[PDB]
């Protein structure tokens, strides 16, 4: 006999396509109030009843830099974060000429903060009054190039009308799961030896991803997942000097810092009904904002990164430098801490060399030896190009403290010339996507193709 | 076996395990209008596939065989090198080029079985 | 014949070509929320018509004949007066006044077949 | 009897009167996007129930009997104290604890029939 | 009395404040039960029931 | 309307005080407008005063 065509429904056949994925949040974050933060506001409560399911003889090729999930996550973040600023104050009367004197806080001079006073159009609008506030010198621009140097302006109002973030939403990085919609699934690669592109054998399917922490950072990666075996080096073309080469760590580093300056919040009424928060007096002595990393762990980490770098560069050593001058959001480790924005000079982190022969990293001189980064603080944030491009961060009282784990690095190879035996590196930053691409690297989405055709000895009977 | 645990298993193993995959094709939630759009798209996709099973007289999860003979140019395969070894993914990687042939041939199979039943339900 | 190429053809000519017309009943796109409303309205209309076909035991594209006798007051036409000459549009222009009794009479046809089949599936 | 007028009638009386209740399961209109969400949820619920009837080989309003023997731990009831007196509401208030078992058993007796019929359409 | 609490608005003088009788309807898949007992004292059973 | 001496019959040269982006350093500016877009300000006699 011959064979005859037969259809089957419920067939495990995958296709690759773009799709829209919704967000899920941890259920305990639904204890919080409505219109508080992104979890209760927009996402769906999760329930881990459909757990991970391993697959058998499957074989799938992943691609990290062609992943559409991060390129959709960026727009999801940009739209939700633009929506979260609408009910707040739009400033506008604060664009006045500022008169700033010497920074006589408790005598002396505080070198970062200027004492300025300005005329406030009050809520009655015909009883405008004098007010005073302390501002950061990154937020203060001289008004004219003439020698009238006691007349100043905010850095905004010549480019955009800025806004203050509402001080009852929070900037806590809530872990956000991405899930598959109806008729879709998420493949996850369990091979820890995965080097950015290519096949994966240990493959599972999940209904929702690992909790992604959307931390915006430059030159270092904050709280995030750790590598499973060793330090992983990922680059789309490692030979390409313009490509950001991401380093994922196995052993975490612990960073802890603060603003050791006992600030005080001041309230000003700007127009009818709505208020504005600024920095008033400073109580206590003036201290420098700084961040700390233990020295022996940092030297151990950079020597291990050099060890992994020697798996692609044969006999050369590994050298580092600081960033190439740049500007504030590019050349400095820029990270959020409790609501404040820190910019730390990273040069002290990378004044070192790995000679290709690793030295015993204990070699005990002092376990309490630390490397220290001076850090500056901005309030007016030029956060993203195209977001509602300005935001004012209100100050928060008391000394803040924060503590986290360094798990990832961003690097750019300085240009290979003269056949040098180092091919030195610089820290990198810029497009935030490669932060999230450091976390969404295990995942792909599959279009389910359920209908299949096979030849069978079956024949329909009349 | 859930939504996709059938992958990798052979033809005989995946002749079973259909409904636990095919039953999870409907869901939806809220993040915005775009998720409603994707939800309606998923519903319309499932409804279109159920319709395409609807023309050919299958109308179920059962092993719906028609009577059209298998041309050799679609597989060029022995029965042993289809059922004993193959799985559905690299079977689809061969057969998927003939959709405008097969998905019209089953509509021709429901051509060849309808009026010659209507006459045997009326002229008999 | 596509979505509407069968119009104008006779009753016996359009006894076929149902499927290529009825297969194009599901789609949608974006200009706003109104288009999504019209899209789910179209999905609702198709699902309602599939439900009305599912009540009468038809459940397919097939030429589903029930056993209720035709009444002369609905057509007053000869068999030749219906089949060889008419097309479906001016047939509808006559028959469309009796929908509220025909769409009840086929549910009455599903009255007269079900519990008898259940007893012949249980009491036998 | 309309959408819910059959409630309170016994087992025998409500063995009939099904479609005039079950036919009113699809509607929708405008007050906002929340009504679109509720409308798509209603369509999803109705489609899921039609699917769940779809696996078990029922695929209609018919009194679809499968072949699992009834276990006494689900009702502990005589035929007279089910059919002659009881109505569906406080029947559900007894049987509803076993629904995740019963809805698995009917798939289990679809996992007893069509491969045998496939062999009786191929190996015969 | 405002402007220290909120900057508020004038109602448009072409909408009106008439209490239009508004009916509530259940969508597809649900139903509305109404208790026709006038002796109903806030909680508990009802027998004269319509839909 | 002295464009290059003489009069352009359609375009009026007008100057107005602009509240600048600093809002407390308002400055004079000038622009040319079309006479369909320009209305005399009041019926009371002050003829060199105009409005959009
Ligand atoms: C910032 O400047 C303001 C001036 O607007 C200072 O306030 C005045 O300080 C002088 C000096 O002690 C007092 O005589 C006045 O009574 C103060 N005026 C008011 C309204 O308080 C203020 O002390 C300065 N603050 C800092 C931290 O430098
Ligand atoms: C503000 O600074 C004080 C003193 O620097 C902090 O208090 C100390 O915090 C350290 C944290 O390691 C503890 O070990 C000490 O026991 C604390 N007390 C003292 C008297 O030193 C305080 O934590 C800081 N504020 C915040 C909010 O962290
Ligand atoms: C429109 O009017 C302005 C006046 O505001 C003219 O500008 C002045 O023209 C005079 C005459 O040549 C010069 O002395 C000034 O230096 C000009 N001032 C400025 C700021 O440029 C302007 O020429 C007129 N333009 C037209 C097209 O009529």
Numbering used by the authors:
A (entry chain K): 32 to 139, 150 to 185, 185a, 185b, 186 to 309, 312 to 321, 321c, 322 to 354, ...
B (entry chain L), C (entry chain B), D (entry chain G): 520 to 547, 569 to 664
E (entry chain F): 194 to 244
F (entry chain A): 134 to 139, 150 to 185, 185a, 185b, 186 to 193
The authors write:
The DH270 lineage is derived from the VH1-2*02 and Vλ2-23 heavy and light chain genes, respectively, with a heavy chain complementary determining region length of twenty amino acid residues, DH270.6, the lineage member with the greatest breadth and potency, neutralizes fifty-one percent of a multiclade pseudovirus panel with a geometric mean potency of ~0.21 µg/ml. From the I2 intermediate the clone splits into two paths, both culminating in similar neutralization breadth, albeit with DH270.6 having the greatest potency. The I2 intermediate acquired additional mutations at clusters 3, 4, and 7, with mature DH270.6, the most broad and potent antibody of the clone, further modifying interactions at cluster 7. The DH270.5 and DH270.6 antibodies acquired several mutations near the LCDR1/VL N-terminus where interactions with the N301-glycan D arms may occur. The cryo-EM reconstructions in this region were poorly resolved, precluding a precise definition of these interactions. Although the N301-glycan D arm was not well-defined in density, the VH and VL of both DH270.5 and DH270.6 acquired several mutations in proximity to the N301-glycan D arm. Densities consistent with both the V3 GDIK coupled and uncoupled V1 loop states were apparent in the DH270.6 bound trimer. Additional mutations in DH270.6 occurred near the N442-glycan and the V1 loop configuration that was displaced from the V3 GDIK motif. Examination of these structures indicates mutations after I2 occurred primarily at regions more distal to the epitope, consistent with the ability of I2 to neutralize most of the viruses neutralized by DH270.6. Additionally, structures of DH270.6 bound to d526 Env containing G300 and d949 Env containing N300 show few changes in the overall epitope conformation.
The HIV-1 Env is a trimer of gp120-gp41 heterodimers that are heavily shielded from the host immune systems by N-linked glycosylation and further protected from neutralization by conformational masking and considerable sequence variability. A glycosylated region near the base of the third variable loop (V3) of HIV-1 Env forms a supersite of vulnerability that is targeted by antibodies originating from diverse germline genes in multiple HIV-1 infected individuals. Here, we determine structures of antibodies in complex with HIV-1 Envelope for all observed members and ancestral states of the broadly neutralizing HIV-1 V3-glycan targeting DH270 antibody clonal B cell lineage. Here we used cryo-EM to visualize the interactions of a complete inferred DH270 clonal tree with the co-evolving virus Env.
